[PDB]
Design a protein around this ligand. Structure first.
Ligand SMILES: C[C@@H]1CC[C@@]2(OC1)O[C@H]1C[C@H]3[C@@H]4CC=C5C[C@@H](OCCC(CO)CO)CC[C@]5(C)[C@H]4CC[C@]3(C)[C@H]1[C@@H]2C
Ligand SMILES: C[C@@H]1CC[C@@]2(OC1)O[C@H]1C[C@H]3[C@@H]4CC=C5C[C@@H](OCCC(CO)CO)CC[C@]5(C)[C@H]4CC[C@]3(C)[C@H]1[C@@H]2C
Ligand SMILES: C[C@@H]1CC[C@@]2(OC1)O[C@H]1C[C@H]3[C@@H]4CC=C5C[C@@H](OCCC(CO)CO)CC[C@]5(C)[C@H]4CC[C@]3(C)[C@H]1[C@@H]2C
Ligand SMILES: C[C@@H]1CC[C@@]2(OC1)O[C@H]1C[C@H]3[C@@H]4CC=C5C[C@@H](OCCC(CO)CO)CC[C@]5(C)[C@H]4CC[C@]3(C)[C@H]1[C@@H]2C
Ligand SMILES: C[C@@H]1CC[C@@]2(OC1)O[C@H]1C[C@H]3[C@@H]4CC=C5C[C@@H](OCCC(CO)CO)CC[C@]5(C)[C@H]4CC[C@]3(C)[C@H]1[C@@H]2C
Ligand SMILES: *[C@@H]1O[C@H](CO)[C@@H](O)[C@H](O)[C@H]1NC(C)=O
Ligand SMILES: *[C@@H]1O[C@H](CO)[C@@H](O)[C@H](O)[C@H]1NC(C)=O
Ligand SMILES: *[C@@H]1O[C@H](CO)[C@@H](O)[C@H](O)[C@H]1NC(C)=O
Ligand SMILES: *[C@@H]1O[C@H](CO)[C@@H](O)[C@H](O)[C@H]1NC(C)=O
Ligand SMILES: *[C@@H]1O[C@H](CO)[C@@H](O)[C@H](O)[C@H]1NC(C)=O
Ligand SMILES: *[C@@H]1O[C@H](CO)[C@@H](O)[C@H](O)[C@H]1NC(C)=O
Ligand SMILES: *[C@@H]1O[C@H](CO)[C@@H](O)[C@H](O)[C@H]1NC(C)=O
Ligand SMILES: *[C@@H]1O[C@H](CO)[C@@H](O)[C@H](O)[C@H]1NC(C)=O
Ligand SMILES: *[C@@H]1O[C@H](CO)[C@@H](O)[C@H](O)[C@H]1NC(C)=O
Ligand SMILES: *[C@@H]1O[C@H](CO)[C@@H](O)[C@H](O)[C@H]1NC(C)=O
Ligand SMILES: *[C@@H]1O[C@H](CO)[C@@H](O)[C@H](O)[C@H]1NC(C)=O
Ligand SMILES: *[C@@H]1O[C@H](CO)[C@@H](O)[C@H](O)[C@H]1NC(C)=O
Ligand SMILES: *[C@@H]1O[C@H](CO)[C@@H](O)[C@H](O)[C@H]1NC(C)=O
Ligand SMILES: *[C@@H]1O[C@H](CO)[C@@H](O)[C@H](O)[C@H]1NC(C)=O
Ligand SMILES: *[C@@H]1O[C@H](CO)[C@@H](O)[C@H](O)[C@H]1NC(C)=O
Ligand SMILES: *[C@@H]1O[C@H](CO)[C@@H](O)[C@H](O)[C@H]1NC(C)=O
Ligand SMILES: *[C@@H]1O[C@H](CO)[C@@H](O)[C@H](O)[C@H]1NC(C)=O
Ligand SMILES: *[C@@H]1O[C@H](CO)[C@@H](O)[C@H](O)[C@H]1NC(C)=O
Ligand SMILES: *[C@@H]1O[C@H](CO)[C@@H](O)[C@H](O)[C@H]1NC(C)=O
Ligand SMILES: *[C@@H]1O[C@H](CO)[C@@H](O)[C@H](O)[C@H]1NC(C)=O
Lengths: 292, 292, 292, 292, 292
């Protein structure tokens, strides 16, 4: 069986004439094809005001190193070792659409190398990735957030994202968003290789949403009556005043929640604006009636 | 008695042919069984809107190194030493359900080694761990937060969590949550070893909660009377208007506190929604009466 | 074709008598002319209360190194290599008008060197840059934010910003601000070289703005009527009281949004102040009428 | 007089056979007695909602090193030197009740060594230390925050906190809290040595607090009259309604300020709850009267 | 002319027998006199609730090294070089009244050395410096914030702040505060050397402030009339109720803005408290009249 000394010898031979900064190919004309695997662990939040989505991912990069092969029979049948990530060449992949808010405490700092040259490198990453949040159909809204991976500085002739496999680990259930992130896309080679995972998020119709809507619908009904109230009923003025005040409060509060950076406005905001306008017109009519 | 020079000699011999990156077993076929001990020090907070729990823990990992044994009689009876954590192999345990918000000022950076090879490594960790917060029975709500430990990258054939012993240190009393975190669980070996400590949290019925409820119950009574008020009492309109305004304010304020990511809705929110609906119906009936 | 060993030989020769801290000119009397390229990727936000603008840029510095030239025919036709940024002299350019909130996870840490001596060094930078935000014409407001680059400590006789090319990458569309940042400016040499990119930002007239304005205009109309209401109409007092309350609420809420550090005040704030003053005068007139 | 070369020789000899990781005693059976001195500089804040206190301290550790003695007559009368803190053994003292939010810009990173072996090591630390904040007697409330020092990992047989001397530097006056932190306590040796400084904080009766009291007392008086108002005065309904609305607003606002993690509730919260209940009962009585 | 090799030789000779941790004087009995130059670049904010002031400064330390002199005629007339700040002794000056929130991205990390021994070391520092904010005369308030520099650990017999020159760079204009920070003060030598720059800040009377006031003055007038309103006018009750509600809202909102840690209270808070008290007394008188 392999022993501690055998692996010490192997690690001594592997790193002898190895340069961490030279791309690991025998012939420099060859590209290193990196395959990326992005698995969502949990979707922490989807911030509308800041147009961001906060989530946690398991990102794994797989590639082949041609300087780091060995014959397992010469080392008591060692077929794979674990090296520190900072001793070996590693593809310069970046989350170039996101703020990577990971700590060093969540950093693995280690990779697995196989005797055939294949490296698997896995890590946890907390990402604040920018999303264009279209609140047009609020609260029945759907969004698409694209999480980008890209090769930092190297040309598509040096390092390439062969493929991006993106999935949902199903580690946690959200109960607020229906997440759909599953697929497999080739890399896009335009002066530098990149790819992105499309994450589709559909707000779930929790009856808390229904509770939020009940005041809106009943206030619409009540405003319809007060606008229909007889011209000289007797309580027109105060009733219309209070109802317009409530409508203004709702119109103010909805704006503070709906995003201001949207492709189209929320239909609910327009509906409440029209409702407040009609309430104001009803109060104006009541004032005119009082004049007469 | 042992002296400074004796320990200098011992530390010189221990680290001579030692590789920090090789797993510390004579035969590479043997697993290293790590036993983890997680003690709660203080539970800082249980953030409902963010679905997080912020707490401080004392985490201790115990394992055995077979490269780091010695005979105490050859070193003037030295039976244990303290080594910097970064000179020796340490298990790659991660809190893979948490944000580890510890500083380097709160990092011990040192471990204790015994002449038999047993290492104890203790640390303080401040964790923001994701919890699925079910506010269904608010404010009589109970929650379960699972704190996960997992071996980062290695297979269950290399490194394993033998056991996870989790307790409450009782260093501070909370006065807001009844914490129940005490037990001892074997690690789960599914392609990589992990375990989790279940923390049960029952909100304590402080009379501040009762103060928050008194307005709700008395407003229920008041709404019942105003809905029961005679059709032509004389103050029906204004009274019902103010009652509905207060009900809407309460329904709005409760939503800003109850979490929007919940398995089931809070019953109190539904109760206040129904109460506001009945208040609106009472105002509608008053309007109809005024019409007649 | 070039091989791994050829590039090892090249990198060994290049760095032999190279000093990272000496400015890279054969004759120390020559200046290093750096050309900077600033490309906006996404404009995250424009914070009015803090007078900041948060954005993401792709910054590239291009210069020429005279110690790091080679003949490609002596190295199997290698025409360019990639070096770690911390092994080579790099111009000390600073964003001396911004908080650089970039992480090490978003840091490229590598530059591309050509056989002629030309270095390209690219990076992603998240900048919180201070802007003097003039909310005079809110919500039809325009702003200019100047993003500064400057040579940290060296005199214009050592390092110089030859040029600054600034553009918009058009990676994302904003839907809230119309961004205009495109041009090319020579560096300014006054005891140390610097330059700045002017970013012109015009608020887009989204109909959400129109929804925000509708209450203001209709309240102006209604206040005009209530001030015009007959002296003894019958509901003057309560109507004017509620309308002044609403005007005060709007005047309070607008202040919390408009910035307090502005060259001139917002015209809308003055308009609402005058509207509230007229509402108060109307209530005063109603009180006087009630006295008579 | 001593010269640069003399101190170079001294520093060369002191560190010759010195091990930074070995506890600095000739005989390993001896304890190192550390004396800690904690001086408050300024108390930044006392956060009630988070149960924290933020302050700045100047912390000094004094101990004796037996490997680092010299005869000043052999070095041209050098009696003390200053060494970098990371070259020498320093006690592993932690603020194990606090979050240490200090930067490296506020880190001295240097200690003073005397020819007799005595080390003084001073530092500035910004601490967020957890406090159990009892708002029972708000706003005449007193609190006690214990700031803990403890030896990180070592047994009381290796490193001991001999003494903790804690004072107030009086650098700034607070005007909001009366701070009382002055004393001298032996360390507690229970499987590891620790100690704590008790900081007593009495809220100062600033008339801004009294101004906050003014509305509560006058509203109590007004509620007493409205509850005493004649059954058929004429304005009972509206007056009671508005007064109950104001009472509910006050009861809601006080809760958002008083902490929810308290040993006992604030008496002011209970008082306002009772007052709101009596206002509701008065409105109920008015409703009953209107029925009759 | 001097060449790359000449500077390589010079830098090789300068650092040969140089100790970065030894204070740079031939005779250890001599002090190193440091002159500090603090220039305000921009004043970001003056946070009243936290009692802080956030600003950006350009800080330059100038001193003389006696180990780092050379004859420029022996090095082809090289008269000054630039060294990395971490290779040379640097005075241990701290901003010991501030939180230094600077990043490594805004860190120059380099100093200029002249053949006569003189070192200039300049840097950008973003400081959060604690200020005792006296809101007594709000909004016509003036404040004094003292920014402290101090020698970290060394006695006045080793390192001294000879002088402190503070100015305003005038890079940006504030439009909210009139800043007056200009002067030149000797250092204070009391067991360790320190100095401070006094920054005087006078709130500018922007009409945004005048606008905030208009509601206060007109509400004072309106309260005066309602208190003067005839005992049986007819609308006394409702009018006084609404006036008191608005007064209470203003008194509540002003408190949330004025600081609670002040030498004296704000006069405006007392004025609004008195106005609310008089409004309450007017309502009490109206209640008494209704009783009669
Ligand atoms: C998630 C995404 C990753 C980042 C990204 O979108 C978001 O950001 C975009 C900006 C692009 C760069 C803009 C300018 C240049 C300069 C050009 O060289 C001219 C030099 C010469 C001019 O005068 C000197 O004089 C080379 C190409 C380069 C670097 C672009 C590369 C692709 C980039 C990085 C794009 C990329 C898709
Ligand atoms: C607290 C918890 C810790 C993290 C965790 O939940 C939360 O997150 C989950 C996601 C899981 C990984 C998903 C995908 C793969 C890829 C597979 O390799 C296929 C390669 C081949 C495919 O095509 C190449 O082509 C190897 C296994 C691995 C890495 C999973 C490991 C277990 C993980 C980390 C789970 C774990 C329980
Ligand atoms: C985006 C922008 C970058 C930063 C910046 O605006 C914002 O900030 C401004 C402050 C300026 C410095 C102020 C003072 C001095 C001292 C002087 O030396 C006298 C020494 C002698 C006095 O008595 C000793 O006794 C040398 C020049 C220097 C360092 C200025 C350089 C330019 C600076 C950095 C300006 C620059 C434009
Ligand atoms: C400000 C304060 C500092 C931190 C502190 O309160 C706050 O936190 C408390 C938690 C305590 C630890 C809990 C458990 C153990 C395990 C035990 O070993 C059994 C091993 C064996 C079991 O089965 C293996 O199988 C050794 C002692 C130790 C480490 C305690 C030390 C004291 C600690 C750190 C206490 C300390 C006072
Ligand atoms: C901006 C400002 C910088 C910081 C500062 O205000 C704010 O903070 C103040 C606290 C002071 C220290 C308090 C206590 C001591 C102990 C004494 O030694 C006795 C040892 C002996 C006792 O028994 C052992 O047994 C030596 C002096 C020292 C360190 C003071 C130095 C000056 C300091 C740092 C002051 C300084 C002005
Ligand atoms: C490199 O190129 C040569 C010639 O093209 C070829 O013979 C050799 O096999 C290549 N090396 C590898 C590893 O493919
Ligand atoms: C090497 O290990 C593999 C996997 O355990 C096994 O199948 C094979 O028989 C081994 N060969 C030798 C020579 O040990
Ligand atoms: C996810 O979205 C894609 C494209 O929008 C669709 O093809 C796929 O069916 C969706 N997945 C599920 C589970 O609905
Ligand atoms: C992706 O690349 C592979 C590799 O050649 C190719 O077979 C495939 O057609 C490409 N497109 C897709 C959608 O897989
Ligand atoms: C390693 O394996 C060999 C053969 O299986 C055995 O003799 C030896 O005792 C093992 N070493 C240890 C430390 O168990
Ligand atoms: C070694 O130390 C242990 C523990 O103090 C003691 O019991 C034993 O007698 C000692 N033996 C020798 C040889 O010193
Ligand atoms: C804690 O919870 C577990 C399971 O929910 C239970 O068995 C145990 O009795 C509880 N502990 C206490 C002290 O109630
Ligand atoms: C855990 O592992 C031990 C070790 O063999 C075993 O005896 C025990 O049955 C396992 N299960 C539990 C619940 O301890
Ligand atoms: C340096 O200066 C000398 C004389 O002025 C000149 O001959 C030489 O070409 C210069 N070197 C370079 C690289 O321009
Ligand atoms: C060197 O490479 C360039 C670019 O591929 C090519 O045009 C040229 O012919 C090559 N020369 C030799 C000698 O290989
Ligand atoms: C951007 O602004 C500059 C100067 O204000 C102007 O010359 C240019 O035309 C503008 N660009 C566009 C696209 O309007
Ligand atoms: C900028 O510098 C170049 C270089 O000489 C010069 O030709 C040009 O006139 C300068 N001004 C502008 C606006 O480009
Ligand atoms: C160490 O112990 C020996 C014997 O107990 C004693 O002679 C010696 O003085 C001790 N060393 C010190 C520094 O106290
Ligand atoms: C050493 O220095 C001390 C303090 O300055 C002084 O009292 C003593 O006389 C000096 N002795 C010698 C030999 O220099
Ligand atoms: C501080 O508190 C302690 C105990 O509570 C007391 O003995 C001491 O007198 C107090 N100090 C002052 C100045 O009141
Ligand atoms: C603290 O320790 C000293 C040292 O022996 C002792 O004299 C004293 O009695 C102890 N207790 C107190 C309160 O100082
Ligand atoms: C150091 O002191 C000696 C004697 O006091 C004196 O001769 C010498 O000039 C001094 N050195 C310096 C650099 O002042
Ligand atoms: C050295 O440089 C200075 C400044 O340029 C110049 O005045 C002087 O003549 C030069 N001397 C020599 C010998 O080069
Ligand atoms: C700044 O303040 C100082 C002292 O308060 C005063 O002497 C000086 O004249 C002031 N400067 C200006 C420009 O007002
Ligand atoms: C400051 O120190 C210098 C240096 O001796 C002295 O001339 C001056 O009088 C001192 N005071 C002031 C205000 O400059």
């Amino acid at each position: 069986t392999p022993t501690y000394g055998d692996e010490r010898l192997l690690r001594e031979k592997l790193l002898t004439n190895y340069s961490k900064s030279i791309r690991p190919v025998i012939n420099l004309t060859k590209v290193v094809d990196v395959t990326a695997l992005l698995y969502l662990q949990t979707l922490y939040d989807l911030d509308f005001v800041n147009n961001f989505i906060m989530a946690r991912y398991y990102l794994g990069l797989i590639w082949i190193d041609e300087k780091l092969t060995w014959n397992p029979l010469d080392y008591n049948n060692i077929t794979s070792i674990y090296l520190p990530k900072d001793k070996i060449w590693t593809p310069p992949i970046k989350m170039c659409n996101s703020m990577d808010k990971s700590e060093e405490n969540d950093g693995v700092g280690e990779l697995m190398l196989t005797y055939t040259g294949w490296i698997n490198m896995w890590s946890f990453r907390l990402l604040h990735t920018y999303c264009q949040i279209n609140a047009y159909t609020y609260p029945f809204d759907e969004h698409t957030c694209e999480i980008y991976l890209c090769v930092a500085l190297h040309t598509i002739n040096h390092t390439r994202i062969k493929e991006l496999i993106y999935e949902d680990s199903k580690f946690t259930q959200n109960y607020k968003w229906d997440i759909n992130v599953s697929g497999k896309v080739n890399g896009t080679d335009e002066l530098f290789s990149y790819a992105f995972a499309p994450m589709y998020l559909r707000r779930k119709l929790t009856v808390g949403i229904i509770a939020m809507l009940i005041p809106t619908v009943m206030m619409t009904i009540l405003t319809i009556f007060v606008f229909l109230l007889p011209p000289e009923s007797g309580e027109k003025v105060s009733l219309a005043t209070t109802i317009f005040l409530s409508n203004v409060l709702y119109l103010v509060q909805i704006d503070k929640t709906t995003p201001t950076n949207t492709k189209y406005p929320s239909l609910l905001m327009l509906y409440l604006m029209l409702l407040s306008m009609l309430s104001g017109i009803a109060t104006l009519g009541s004032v005119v009636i009082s004049k007469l």
